[PDB]
Amino acid sequence: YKIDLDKIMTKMKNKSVINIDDVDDEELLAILYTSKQFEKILKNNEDSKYLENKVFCSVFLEPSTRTRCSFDAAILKLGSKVLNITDMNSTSFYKGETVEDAFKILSTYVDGIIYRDPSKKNVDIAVSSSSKPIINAGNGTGEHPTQSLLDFYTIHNYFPFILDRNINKKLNIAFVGDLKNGRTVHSLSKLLSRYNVSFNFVSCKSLNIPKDIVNTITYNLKKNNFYSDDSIKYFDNLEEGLEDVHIIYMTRINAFILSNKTLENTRDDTKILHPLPRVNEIKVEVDSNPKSVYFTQAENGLYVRMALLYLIFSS
Amino acid sequence: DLDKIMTKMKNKSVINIDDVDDEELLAILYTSKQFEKILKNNEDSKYLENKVFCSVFLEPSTRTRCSFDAAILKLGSKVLNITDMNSTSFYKGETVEDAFKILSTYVDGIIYRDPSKKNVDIAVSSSSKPIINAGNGTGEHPTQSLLDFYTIHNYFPFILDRNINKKLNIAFVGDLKNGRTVHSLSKLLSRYNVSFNFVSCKSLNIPKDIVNTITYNLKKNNFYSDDSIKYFDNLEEGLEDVHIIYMTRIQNAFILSNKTLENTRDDTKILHPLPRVNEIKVEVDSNPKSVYFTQAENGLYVRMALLYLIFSSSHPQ
Amino acid sequence: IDLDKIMTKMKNKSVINIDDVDDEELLAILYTSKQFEKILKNNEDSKYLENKVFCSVFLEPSTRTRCSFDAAILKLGSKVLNITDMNSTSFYKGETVEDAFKILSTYVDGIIYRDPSKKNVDIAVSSSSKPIINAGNGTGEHPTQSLLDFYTIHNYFPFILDRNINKKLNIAFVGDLKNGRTVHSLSKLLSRYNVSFNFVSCKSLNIPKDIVNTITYNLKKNNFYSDDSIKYFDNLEEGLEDVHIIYMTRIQKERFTDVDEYNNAFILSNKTLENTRDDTKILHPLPRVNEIKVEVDSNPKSVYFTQAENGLYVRMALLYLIFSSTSSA
Numbered sequence: 001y002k003i004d005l006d007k008i009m010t011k012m013k014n015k016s017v018i019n020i021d022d023v024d025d026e027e028l029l030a031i032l033y034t035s036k037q038f039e040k041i042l043k044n045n046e047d048s049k050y051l052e053n054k055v056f057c058s059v060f061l062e063p064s065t066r067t068r069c070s071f072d073a074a075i076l077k078l079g080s081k082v083l084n085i086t087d088m089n090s091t092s093f094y095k096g097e098t099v100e101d102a103f104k105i106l107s108t109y110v111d112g113i114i115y116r117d118p119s120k121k122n123v124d125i126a127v128s129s130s131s132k133p134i135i136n137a138g139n140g141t142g143e144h145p146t147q148s149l150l151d152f153y154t155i156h157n158y159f160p161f162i163l164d165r166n167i168n169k170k171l172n173i174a175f176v177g178d179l180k181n182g183r184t185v186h187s188l189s190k191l192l193s194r195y196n197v198s199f200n201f202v203s204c205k206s207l208n209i210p211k212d213i214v215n216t217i218t219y220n221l222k223k224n225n226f227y228s229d230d231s232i233k234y235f236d237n238l239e240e241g242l243e244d245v246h247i248i249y250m251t252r253i254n255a256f257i258l259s260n261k262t263l264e265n266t267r268d269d270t271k272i273l274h275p276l277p278r279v280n281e282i283k284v285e286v287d288s289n290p291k292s293v294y295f296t297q298a299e300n301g302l303y304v305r306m307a308l309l310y311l312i313f314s315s
Numbered sequence: 316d317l318d319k320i321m322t323k324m325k326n327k328s329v330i331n332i333d334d335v336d337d338e339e340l341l342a343i344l345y346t347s348k349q350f351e352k353i354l355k356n357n358e359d360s361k362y363l364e365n366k367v368f369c370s371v372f373l374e375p376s377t378r379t380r381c382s383f384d385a386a387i388l389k390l391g392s393k394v395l396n397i398t399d400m401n402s403t404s405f406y407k408g409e410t411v412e413d414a415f416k417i418l419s420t421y422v423d424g425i426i427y428r429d430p431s432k433k434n435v436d437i438a439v440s441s442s443s444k445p446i447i448n449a450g451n452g453t454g455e456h457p458t459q460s461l462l463d464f465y466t467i468h469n470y471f472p473f474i475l476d477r478n479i480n481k482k483l484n485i486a487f488v489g490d491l492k493n494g495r496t497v498h499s500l501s502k503l504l505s506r507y508n509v510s511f512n513f514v515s516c517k518s519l520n521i522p523k524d525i526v527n528t529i530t531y532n533l534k535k536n537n538f539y540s541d542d543s544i545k546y547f548d549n550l551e552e553g554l555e556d557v558h559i560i561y562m563t564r565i566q567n568a569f570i571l572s573n574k575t576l577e578n579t580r581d582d583t584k585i586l587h588p589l590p591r592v593n594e595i596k597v598e599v600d601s602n603p604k605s606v607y608f609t610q611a612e613n614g615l616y617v618r619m620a621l622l623y624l625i626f627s628s629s630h631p632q
Numbered sequence: 633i634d635l636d637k638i639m640t641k642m643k644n645k646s647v648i649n650i651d652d653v654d655d656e657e658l659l660a661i662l663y664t665s666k667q668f669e670k671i672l673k674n675n676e677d678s679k680y681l682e683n684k685v686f687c688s689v690f691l692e693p694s695t696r697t698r699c700s701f702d703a704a705i706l707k708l709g710s711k712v713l714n715i716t717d718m719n720s721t722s723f724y725k726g727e728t729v730e731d732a733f734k735i736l737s738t739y740v741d742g743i744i745y746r747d748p749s750k751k752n753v754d755i756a757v758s759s760s761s762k763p764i765i766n767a768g769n770g771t772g773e774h775p776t777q778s779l780l781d782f783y784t785i786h787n788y789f790p791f792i793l794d795r796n797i798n799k800k801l802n803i804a805f806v807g808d809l810k811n812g813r814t815v816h817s818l819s820k821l822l823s824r825y826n827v828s829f830n831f832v833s834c835k836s837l838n839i840p841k842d843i844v845n846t847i848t849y850n851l852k853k854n855n856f857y858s859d860d861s862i863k864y865f866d867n868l869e870e871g872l873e874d875v876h877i878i879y880m881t882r883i884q885k886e887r888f889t890d891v892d893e894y895n896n897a898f899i900l901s902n903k904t905l906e907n908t909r910d911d912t913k914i915l916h917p918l919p920r921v922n923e924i925k926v927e928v929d930s931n932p933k934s935v936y937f938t939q940a941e942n943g944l945y946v947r948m949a950l951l952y953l954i955f956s957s958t959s960s961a
């Protein structure tokens with residue numbers, strides 16, 4: 001189709017996925033391609049059991065029901081099995097024990113571990129100590145790689161020229177709301193800036209985007225000669241914010257409540273993403289508007305997570 | 316006719332016992348009996364593989380959850396469990412509509428228990444996938460009524476005949492005001508040729524609304540008389556000529572002993588949704604009239620039946 | 633030797649106490665456990681017990697034993713309903729254990745049960761129509777810990793099984809011997825063989841007399857008892873002298889009236905391992921907190937991580953032996 005695969009599978013076998021930076025251009029292509037294969041299989045109610053005989057541990061040490069249920073659905077649909085650790089925090093699970101000991105032991109029982117922990121540190125220790133691959137399901141640095149991949153998958157389906165890399169093939173996107181703490185913005189901003197992309201950061205002063213992320217965007221745009229001083233624009237209101245943008249990404253939380261009113265002066269092709277849950281940021285009326293795709297976006301998580309597990313754990 | 320009735324039930328939500336009509340009950344009771352023999356003969360039970368369900372229990376209800384999960388696993392399917400949360404810890408903020416719109420894109424079907432009447436209704440509205448109610452706050456617990464009715468049908472199969480000469484009599488005993496298990500089953504029974512002895516204390520008398528549904532449904536099949544519904548204060552009169560004694564829970568006055576079972580019909584059988592406390596004495600467990608343990612066991616066979624009928628995309632023998 | 637006979641003996645066996653496991657059964661277990669070790673280490677199919685549906689009831693947080701038992705059930709190719717993050721009272725609610733187990737056992741092929749209550753597990757076996765494996769209770773009965781403890785020893789010193797007057801194993805149990813009920817269970821299993829014991833403790837945490845009496849009784853039964861069969865020490869220097877196995881116990885803040893009582897007398901270092909036999913191996917049921925230093929993990933005498941890993945293989949063996957329908961693969 002585009003790139004070799006099956007030597008990309010060889011490259012991904014037993015790979016830990018902690019940060020979106022652990023995923024290079026070829027791996028992204030395998031994932032996006034594999035994700036699309038699982039989409040059609042499931043949409044045709046065909047056999048999905050392409051990874052059996054595998055037993056995974058799911059460790060969720062913060063309530064994050066939707067990501068856990070996603071990862072469990074992916075594991076079960078591939079025809080594998082999973083033991084769950086759940087409804088506990090960092091302290092009830094470790095009790096006394098060091099993370100290093102806990103992961104050294106847990107990794108002798110299972111083929112791989114899905115790990116969510118508020119602590120940035122704990123996931124890094126867990127990779128140090130685990131004899132088995134770990135997928136980060138979310139931590140405290142805002143590394144949530146599988147959210148980036150399904151965010152990117154969703155975009156790719158409506159605008160596949162993001163992948164084509166060409167000063168012609170330029171996508172514009174507006175991130176809106178809490179840009180300081182929207183770690184989902186940061187992770188995706190990082191993946192996007194590898195391609196021909198422009199950014200409208202719509203925030204209220206105290207929640208402006210961090211400079212560290214601006215510098216990574218700038219660095220990565222320059223690497224592919226897609227950077228200009230018109231690559232990044234800041235806005236204080238939705239009016240101007242929501243303009244010539246192919247994607248509107250709303251963050252969790254306000255100042256910016258998306259209505260059918262405020263979507264009147266957007267491109268006709270604009271699509272609206274939201275990692276969810278929404279609390280007020282997007283009004284129920286918008287759900288009917290064919291520009292909204294946040295529910296397809298959540299659905300895509302299944303197909304992407306199946307792809308990632310198949311690519312890493314298949315023998 | 317299975318390849319008609321199955322086709323009618325495919326992707327059906329079961330929220331209330333009135334979502335189950337005459338022919339659906341017959342498919343269920345027939346399929347339930349097939350799963351009974353298969354399991355009792357240690358034969359292959361994997362009639363529904365490659366299916367992934369979500370079980371959401373937002374109230375501690377271990378027996379029903381374990382039942383539904385056993386059924387899903389024994390049919391050869393898989394299940395993600397949501398558990399030890401209440402309405403607020405799950406939905407940490409999120410609308411039920413969003414939560415079910417998303418969750419239903421991951422799974423083939425959902426078993427949902429929630430104290431809230433409202434939530435289950437919203438869940439059906441928003442879900443792209445079938446829901447089976449495992450219990451809510453309206454007292455809709457359909458699968459309990461089905462296994463209650465399954466158990467009765469095994470000892471007295473003429474309830475299904477609707478024959479003016481083959482009437483079943485049953486005594487419901489204990490908390491009839493709040494025993495919504497009584498209400499759901501009373502509703503299913505009154506569709507057939509059945510008579511009711513309500514044995515209660517004043518403040519726990521059966522509600523008027525239930526009496527009107529019984530009356531309505533008896534009349535519908537011309538099985539109604541003034542001796543269709545009899546009220547009692549005591550077991551001696553209560554247990555008179557009753558084929559079934561259904562004891563209720565309490566959250567005492569009516570304690571079933573071997574004494575109180577002496578002047579019952581020989582064929583009388585004793586049901587109890589469980590758990591019991593002091594309403595039935597351990598001595599009665601030995602008495603061959605008691606079937607409350609077989610009744611809980613029947614829930615596996617009925618829940619398997621209902622899942623197979625709804626989710627199946629070689630009909631079982 | 634004769635697995636076709638011993639498997640037939642174990643089919644539908646409940647395993648509550650290490651005394652429910654006799655000589656022949658131990659040998660089936662140790663033999664089967666070693667088969668599952670190689671299968672898993674060769675990435676071969678391990679699905680020797682499919683179409684089985686188990687309930688795992690954990691009514692105290694004991695996450696490592698539960699995850700172990702879950703891994704074993706899943707790797708054998710079977711399925712499990714989990715009860716978890718409950719205590720005796722939130723589960724049961726009103727209900728009698730007898731009713732609860734009479735019902736639960738009609739749904740499933742077998743039950744893994746952990747409950748602090750000694751009583752509850754006994755009632756559960758009496759009422760259950762289906763086999764129960766005790767995963768740990770309040771009498772200190774934790775049979776699967778004994779078996780994997782003994783499995784690990786047997787791999788480094790297989791002459792424990794020979795019961796040969798001239799091939800005696802010596803072992804040091806170290807730390808909390810009063811409350812280390814892991815020591816008690818294993819002491820009981822070991823004393824059936826040609827074994828000698830160094831109990832290394834602080835006065836307050838000396839081994840209980842009733843355990844010493846069982847050891848003494850069981851050694852005498854096989855004519856392996858002497859006055860040098862059981863030696864007490866206060867210190868590691870004498871403790872660790874000529875011992876093939878050093879078993880470190882846990883020290884659990886709980887069991888101690890107050891935080892002050894807790895304060896960590898016997899800390900195994902590379903220093904303290906200088907005057908041990910060359911072949912000595914170090915076990916620890918885990919988790920550790922301070923009693924073994926991280927430096928020791930590199931020292932080739934340490935096997936406590938292999939020991940935890942062995943629990944998968946032993947739990948697979950035990951499930952396969954007990955639940956496999958009239959099987960021979």
Ligand SMILES: COCCNC(=O)c1cc(-c2ccccc2)sc1N
Pocket residue numbers: 093094095096097102693694695696697698768917918919
């Ligand atoms: C972080 O480590 C958790 C404990 N891991 C374990 O080894 C474990 C759990 C148990 C336990 C531990 C303390 C108090 C009561 C029971 S028994 C067992 N196999």
Ligand code: NA
Pocket residue numbers: 082394395712
């Ligand atoms: Na499970």
